[PDB]
Design a protein around this ligand. Structure first.
Ligand SMILES: NC(=O)c1ccc[n+]([C@@H]2O[C@H](COP(=O)([O-])OP(=O)(O)OC[C@H]3O[C@@H](n4cnc5c(N)ncnc54)[C@H](O)[C@@H]3O)[C@@H](O)[C@H]2O)c1
Ligand SMILES: NC(=O)c1ccc[n+]([C@@H]2O[C@H](COP(=O)([O-])OP(=O)(O)OC[C@H]3O[C@@H](n4cnc5c(N)ncnc54)[C@H](O)[C@@H]3O)[C@@H](O)[C@H]2O)c1
Ligand SMILES: NC(=O)c1ccc[n+]([C@@H]2O[C@H](COP(=O)([O-])OP(=O)(O)OC[C@H]3O[C@@H](n4cnc5c(N)ncnc54)[C@H](O)[C@@H]3O)[C@@H](O)[C@H]2O)c1
Ligand SMILES: NC(=O)c1ccc[n+]([C@@H]2O[C@H](COP(=O)([O-])OP(=O)(O)OC[C@H]3O[C@@H](n4cnc5c(N)ncnc54)[C@H](O)[C@@H]3O)[C@@H](O)[C@H]2O)c1
Ligand SMILES: Cc1c(Cl)cccc1NC(=O)[C@H]1CC(=O)N(C2CCCCC2)C1
Ligand SMILES: Cc1c(Cl)cccc1NC(=O)[C@H]1CC(=O)N(C2CCCCC2)C1
Ligand SMILES: Cc1c(Cl)cccc1NC(=O)[C@H]1CC(=O)N(C2CCCCC2)C1
Ligand SMILES: Cc1c(Cl)cccc1NC(=O)[C@H]1CC(=O)N(C2CCCCC2)C1
Lengths: 268, 268, 268, 268
């Protein structure tokens, strides 16, 4: 009697135990889902990480910039879940921007080759993955991607902000395509989560000013959030993704659900 | 093992079996919730209607323009659910605008006394009800109100649109207050639902042009919605309200969830 | 060869020499406009204030809660500008909320009678004034009102925020009506301007916490604004209103122009 | 005594006499501006076209994908306007998406190489051009780019919609950089303008369904616009760009001005 009992769900984006996708996978399994995981490049690492999940789940390789991986993905998923079975859910939890595109590196100095690679991985791939998986998704199914509200500019996030603006637009078009299959497509806009890399940025990995700016953003976020915001706790975000994967938001698509403590609704 | 197992939830706004709140109440009971209902003016009618719900629920009188009713409400609710028990949820499903404020009656001809009464009932009362009930709500609780997206003007909806714009603003302030209690506050923006009164408007009750315009809006809504929109089915809306009443959107507050088929995300 | 050469423009909302409308009137006259002014209650005061404007302008009494004043207004304006002449512009620079609706007074404690009076004056009156004046406006004309961005909640502004949310909605409907006359309707959303009353609030007139919160908002606004924000200078706002009154934004209506230093486009 | 008397303004994006930039250039010259034009690839054609403008203006080559052209641009502009003179304005009126990214070609079938080229030209280049020209812009100056509202998905516009979503985000970051120079950055979101290429699309150049869909969008736009919308008249758009280039919107930056008849403010 879990929220996702019987559902077959693909989850991308695990790379460490602090990955938002690790917590999405954990909560989905606690609620009865059967998972297929996808991982990029370091598959030995990812397998060792996902051994800590509450249940076993097959791990498939997927580099979203690799056309061969995308073309073979549905077949590999079907092999893993059994002929005649389809997916009920897909989680896109993938993002990347080269360091020239973030941090104290000036906005104008990011070469377009770098920005293009960030937009490929962070925005276009939401459409790539939907293209690959919709043919093996059931009616009533759900595609969910992770967003960070890009409606306003901010220090340091720079071209990643642009990539998220693109992703939000991509999501509204994926909803048009997915609708033909009876499938919903939505994003969860999360507040800041202190992953490994974010702690590295606070420690100055992308420059001192950038670290300082992110600490100020984190502090302000919890202040503005009427119910507070705990950057060390991804569980509320994971629960929100599972809500979208369930049968309980059946008339929402092309849309963005804010799991951010309510901060974006408050000026100060 | 229902979505709302053990939760005590107040539901306002039932007046007929086509009321959106009737379907919210039905689905919440199917998912294990224990309800207290509130009704306006025709309590004999409302009792006979709610006899058709799957489980029994006490009915309390509440005119939101009546200060005495509001001042006594928490005590009456506590009497109904038992001393030492509090509410986990509150549903505001209340709206009203005099006929001078809607339909073919010119926008400029609505007297302010009429508009004020519509705004009192449709917007201010969301704050009134929160004031009354927050002192008897548990941490983790949820206040939900019904919205119709007023971001753009449209024919005939006229001053009711203005009242909804006000309600959206009220909701962001109620979230600030509710947050002190560990309680969330959100609206569900539903697509058009063919209630009794809406069928009456399509039949020309507020003028012929108004009826024609609403039929065009309904048709366009289903067209734009990537997953379609069934104006005769309130269940998807009721499910969305129950999602917000559950524990599965714990980091959303001051916000608006669109249960509209995705229509507001598509231009055409 | 001023921006507004030959145009006849009604300007409401002057009460002191720090009124935003005083600066709108000054700049409009510097650019060639012929004005008619309207004033509320203290007409002797207002006349003495407007004697300092660069050119003479007739002053008419207008209490927007007074139906007789509204019903007679067009005739009084026509008397002042001459039979056979019409207005090219109207400026609404009127707002009010009782002190129970702002400041440290709790949001839930504002009586609806108070909120209703604030919404009447601050939102409904935009429609009242358009109703009164559209019959004596020329094609190509422009109605402009003053807004403070209410898209997010904030401390202390409380029910005035709600009134502005209502005003934004009203403006989109006034645009529908005005369009029949070839007239545009828009709002200017200004950043914070340190008028007499705002200095009084910073000095604690609506409670100490409220004053502290407004000083923080002011400081943050200038920080966020990419071109800065000078709360002591209403001229940039006045220029923006004159831009809307001119012939140079002929395809904008139902809309909001932000004269806020760009602050609403930046998170921090 | 023109709106732009004495101002030196760079205008990009002319390719035919139906180019929106041709009308921007014409109106700016009618209002006293001194222009420098930039053109892509067919410079003989562009020179013959711009011979029809009311005044002479030097034409410089600029392919925004060409790094050498960008690196040399400021020097070439300075050579054209005279050492010791700087620009007061820059107009970005550049867009491109390969045909795989628009029309009836399925959204999922656009190769990323194609999408990337569209985003390079249509979005990244707004930042490229600002980088190149800000060092030779005066305080009080203005950078303006052309937008088509991408807040909602729509048929056929497909990946160009995504590129515009990216451009809107880019504009908010360019505003941060430009602010250091005392320069504003804004976009004008225009309604549909029947250029040569758009007539070609209506005639079926990107598929029959796409042409049909654009005709429906055009018709609906004029219907929704409270003051109407004339797709054959770029002058209202050109005037709006000149308003932003003038001194009359001095507190607007990082923002979007809608020159669309008010259509985006109305649902129907
Ligand atoms: N951390 C936050 O503050 C935050 C906030 C809101 C949204 N998000 C978003 O959540 C998502 C997950 O981020 P995270 O914070 O968990 O970081 P993460 O580093 O743990 O996850 C990013 C993932 O993207 C994967 N990835 C990179 N290149 C790839 C490629 N070529 N093919 C496939 N996968 C590839 C990485 O392997 C990694 O698993 C991202 O979309 C991020 O933008 C993060
Ligand atoms: N029907 C739709 O298309 C639609 C769409 C979106 C949102 N909504 C909203 O959903 C909510 C419920 O509307 P509905 O369509 O179910 O209509 P409804 O008529 O069934 O419900 C409106 C309720 O408000 C109650 N009410 C009126 N005055 C009251 C007062 N003084 N005190 C207390 N209650 C009072 C009525 O008794 C009734 O129960 C409203 O907020 C409405 O604006 C409706
Ligand atoms: N000051 C700011 O920070 C700021 C920022 C953005 C928008 N605004 C808006 O600008 C407008 C003007 O405000 P201001 O700051 O210049 O203050 P102000 O006090 O100088 O102007 C408010 C005006 O409203 C008038 N008014 C009140 N009740 C009236 C009635 N019954 N009939 C007619 N007029 C009536 C007052 O006489 C006064 O002239 C208001 O809409 C305000 O909300 C102000
Ligand atoms: N036509 C409309 O309906 C409409 C509506 C809103 C916005 N817009 C926008 O207005 C702008 C101008 O479009 P238009 O309709 O006048 O079409 P247009 O074809 O006349 O202008 C597009 C211009 O981009 C130029 N361009 C393409 N690749 C380039 C490159 N590598 N380097 C430099 N310039 C390059 C072309 O030469 C051309 O001059 C675009 O941003 C477009 O997206 C158009
Ligand atoms: C919010 C912020 C600022 Cl202001 C400055 C720098 C960094 C951040 N926050 C992040 O980068 C967060 C949000 C986000 O999309 N990611 C991604 C995580 C995966 C690799 C690319 C970045 C991590
Ligand atoms: C959408 C629409 C148009 Cl366009 C014109 C007229 C009516 C409507 N739709 C409605 O009025 C719907 C949406 C809404 O808030 N209610 C309320 C139902 C309760 C009494 C007041 C109106 C019913
Ligand atoms: C921005 C702010 C906060 Cl946060 C708290 C209190 C006050 C304010 N700012 C104001 O009230 C500004 C903005 C505004 O509409 N007015 C109105 C001025 C006329 C009388 C009613 C208020 C003055
Ligand atoms: C609005 C629309 C639809 Cl719905 C479908 C197809 C085309 C369009 N409209 C356009 O493409 C308009 C708006 C726009 O950015 N351009 C650009 C003109 C320059 C080359 C790339 C496209 C022309």
């Amino acid at each position: 009697t879990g929220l996702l009992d019987g559902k077959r769900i693909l989850v991308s984006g695990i790379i460490t135990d602090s990955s938002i996708a690790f917590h999405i996978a954990r909560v989905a399994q606690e609620q009865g889902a059967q998972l297929v995981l996808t991982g990029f490049d370091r598959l030995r690492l990812i397998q060792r990480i996902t051994d800590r999940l509450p249940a076993k789940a097959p791990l498939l390789e997927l580099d979203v910039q690799n056309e061969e991986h995308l073309a073979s993905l549905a077949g590999r998923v079907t092999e893993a879940i059994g002929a005649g079975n389809k997916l009920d859910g897909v989680v896109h939890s993938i993002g990347f921007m080269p360091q020239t595109g973030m941090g104290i590196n000036p906005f104008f100095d990011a070469p377009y080759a770098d920005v293009s690679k960030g937009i490929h991985i962070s925005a276009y791939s939401y459409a790539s993955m939907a293209k690959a998986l919709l043919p093996i998704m059931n009616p009533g199914g759900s595609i969910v991607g992770m967003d960070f509200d890009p409606s306003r500019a901010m220090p340091a996030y720079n071209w990643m902000t642009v990539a998220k603006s693109a992703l939000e637009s991509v999501n509204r078009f994926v909803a048009r395509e997915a609708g033909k299959y009876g499938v919903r497509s939505n994003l969860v806009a999360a507040g800041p989560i202190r992953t490994l890399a974010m702690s590295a940025i606070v420690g100055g990995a992308l420059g001192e000013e950038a670290g300082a700016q992110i600490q100020l953003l984190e502090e302000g976020w919890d202040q503005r959030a009427p119910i507070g915001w705990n950057m060390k706790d991804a569980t509320p975000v994971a629960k929100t993704v599972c809500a979208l994967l369930s049968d309980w938001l059946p008339a929402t698509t092309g849309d963005i659900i804010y799991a951010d403590g309510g901060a974006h609704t408050q000026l100060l």
